[PDB]
Design a protein around this ligand. Structure first.
Ligand SMILES: [Hg+2]
Length: 216
């Protein structure tokens, strides 16, 4: 695979956002992967609506969490609106998907990374942004303000974020994660999580559950 990939270098990653007052990480992560395969297949970076998935993705639970593959299923069946035509309110509303103008971004299906294995994950990352899970409940994670993150954390994953790159940095393997906690957190909104090698739940269960949208 390439030894280092950064989708931000590619123009495939939109600015860091903030969830505000809502458990919508599932939606923000599915959004970010969909922006990325979007820019990769079409050349156009656009920002898409997290609020469409909070209000319309009925299998997820709004502002009380959700599941990145369901969201990704949602986009494959229904496509998904411009963040500007269906703006983010940080609470669960009724689904307005029908009433919103602008172009729909559409995908065709969902890719499941075979979990618990480093190279499977990077093979996916080396092709596009991937939705992954992490255990975020640990103080070290919530107070993370930069460096290669090795824990401590457990594998009780509770938070969906987006793998937007991976690489080696003054010799450690990491994965480059876009969080949705604002640019105040971590390295201006990103985290570099230590790569466990081969077959592993990953640092902080980083390998336990990886999905991406398929398109074009
Ligand atoms: Hg979360």
């Amino acid at each position: 695979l390439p030894e280092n990939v950064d989708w931000r270098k590619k123009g495939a990653v939109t600015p860091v956002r903030h969830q505000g007052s809502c458990g919508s990480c599932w939606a923000f992560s599915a959004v970010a992967t969909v922006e990325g395969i979007n820019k990769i297949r079409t050349g156009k970076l656009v920002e898409l609506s997290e609020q469409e998935l909070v209000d319309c993705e009925r299998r997820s639970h709004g502002c009380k969490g959700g599941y990145p593959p369901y969201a990704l299923e949602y986009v494959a069946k229904n496509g998904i609106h411009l963040r500007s035509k269906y703006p983010y309110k940080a609470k669960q509303g009724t689904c307005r998907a029908k009433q919103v103008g602008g172009p729909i971004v559409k995908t065709s299906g969902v890719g499941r990374v075979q979990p618990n294995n480093e190279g499977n994950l990077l093979n996916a990352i080396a092709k596009q942004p991937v939705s992954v899970v992490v255990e975020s409940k640990g103080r070290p994670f919530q107070l993370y303000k930069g460096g290669i993150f090795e824990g401590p954390c457990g594998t009780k994953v509770d938070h969906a974020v987006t793998a937007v790159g991976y690489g080696k940095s003054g010799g450690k393997g990491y994965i480059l994660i876009k969080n949705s906690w604002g640019t105040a957190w971590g390295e201006k909104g990103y985290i570099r999580i230590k790569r466990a090698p081969g077959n592993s739940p990953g640092v902080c269960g980083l390998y336990k559950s990886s999905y991406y949208p398929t398109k074009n």
